[PDB]
Amino acid sequence: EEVRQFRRLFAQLAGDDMEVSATELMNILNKVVTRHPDLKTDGFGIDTCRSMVAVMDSDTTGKLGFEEFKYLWNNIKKWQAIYKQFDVDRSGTIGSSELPGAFEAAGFHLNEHLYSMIIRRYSDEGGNMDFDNFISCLVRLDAMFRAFKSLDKDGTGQIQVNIQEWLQLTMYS
Amino acid sequence: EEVRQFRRLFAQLAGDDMEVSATELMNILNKVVTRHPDLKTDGFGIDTCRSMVAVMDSDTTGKLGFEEFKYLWNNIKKWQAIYKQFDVDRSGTIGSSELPGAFEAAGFHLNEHLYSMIIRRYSDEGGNMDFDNFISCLVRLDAMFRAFKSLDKDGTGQIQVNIQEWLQLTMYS
Ligand SMILES: [Ca+2]
Ligand SMILES: [Ca+2]
Ligand SMILES: [Ca+2]
Ligand SMILES: [Ca+2]
Ligand SMILES: [Ca+2]
Ligand SMILES: [Ca+2]
Ligand SMILES: [Ca+2]
Ligand SMILES: [Ca+2]
């Protein structure tokens, strides 16, 4: 069964301390993207992986346990499919005019101002976003959405935080 | 005069569009750290530089204007001196027990929980933080402190933000 083998894959990757570190994540992600040249990327750098691990480290162990990893992994599989689905011109990258569609297909409805911010931070000089940038952006985006929602359970449209919560949320990412 | 030559240095680095991009920043920072082997680092990666630029891009031009760059540059000079001052064992890295002193010397008084979060995100398996990590952490930390303060001018100890402000603040960094 697929479930059983994924479980084994995690155990194999996590190794000795049984959790996946940012370095362990980087290695499996780069080794996997290489098998997909149709996904333009300069690779998953260590800093990007430490950001993805932190944002996914809900139990604050510093690394990814099975569930955290499973969630991340499935999200990546889903976003990888979307990435290719919306790269209509086969540039191997998500361009400025393909981004809104890709994000909305991933379940994220942002506005013009937010999209421009995203492009400025995760896209290149030509408004192009490669695969590792696309994936890390969405991992972070999904996480920031979840964080806001969990802090606004009554749906008031606003959250209130002190400096310690603020720094924990913004720095550990 | 030093002021005049720094102004020229910025103009030279910013080039054609007269602002310093993340790539332009990365290049000058790496070319400068190399002249200091006493500063252990795997170098300033592009993703780290895009994070530093975004967090410093107060006018949201996507790049660093003279003032933004000047502020960043002076901060780095100041933190570089502190980095060496507190690396008492000359490991070329700021270790777990040197961190609190370094940060407090930089004007940041955090608590145990915040420091542990920092170590988990910016230090290595051995609790060691290299130069590029140290600098990018403080750039971000200083920025998150300023952002909170500007949103809490009455000093109530809390800020209240909607989802759009939240995402702008957390994603553009
Ligand atoms: Ca491990
Ligand atoms: Ca964890
Ligand atoms: Ca495309
Ligand atoms: Ca990239
Ligand atoms: Ca420029
Ligand atoms: Ca700017
Ligand atoms: Ca040291
Ligand atoms: Ca580093």
Swiss-Prot record, chains A, B:
Q: What the record says about its domains?
A: The contact of the 5th EF-hand domain from each monomer allows the formation of the homodimer and also appears to mediate the contact between the large catalytic subunit and small regulatory subunit for the formation of the heterodimer. EF-hand domains are paired. EF-hand 1 is paired with EF-hand 2 and EF-hand 3 is paired with EF-hand 4. The fifth EF-hand domain, left unpaired, does not bind the calcium but is responsible of the dimerization by EF-embrace. The first four EF-hand domains bind calcium, however it is not sure if the binding of EF-hand 4 to calcium is physiologically relevant.
- Tell me the ranges covered by the EF-hand domain, including all copies: 1-35, 44-77, 74-109, 110-138, 139-173
Q: Which organism is it from?
A: Sus scrofa
Q: Does the keyword Membrane apply?
A: yes
* Residues bearing PTM N6-acetyllysine: K84
Please give the name of this protein.
Answer: Calpain small subunit 1
The UniProt annotation places Ca(2+) 2 binding at D57, D59, T61, K63, E68
Query: GO terms for molecular function, please?
Result: calcium ion binding; calcium-dependent cysteine-type endopeptidase activity
Residues that, per the record, bind Ca(2+) 1: A14, D17, E19, E24
Keyword annotations: Acetylation, Calcium, Cell membrane, Cytoplasm, Membrane, Metal-binding, Phosphoprotein, Repeat
What is one process in the GO biological process aspect for this record?
Answer: proteolysis
Q: Which GO terms describe its cellular component?
A: calpain complex; cytoplasm; plasma membrane
Question: Which positions bind Ca(2+) 3?
Answer: D87, D89, S91, T93, E98
Q: Where in the cell is it found?
A: Cytoplasm; Cell membrane
Report residues binding Ca(2+) 4. D42, D130
Residues annotated as coiled-coil are none
The keyword Acetylation is annotated on this UniProt entry: yes
At the top level, the lineage of the source is Eukaryota
Gene encoding this chain?
CAPNS1
Q: What does this protein do?
A: Regulatory subunit of the calcium-regulated non-lysosomal thiol-protease which catalyzes limited proteolysis of substrates involved in cytoskeletal remodeling and signal transduction. Essential for embryonic development.
Please give the subunit comment from the record: Homodimer or heterodimer of a large (catalytic) and a small (regulatory) subunit. In presence of calcium, the heterodimer dissociates.
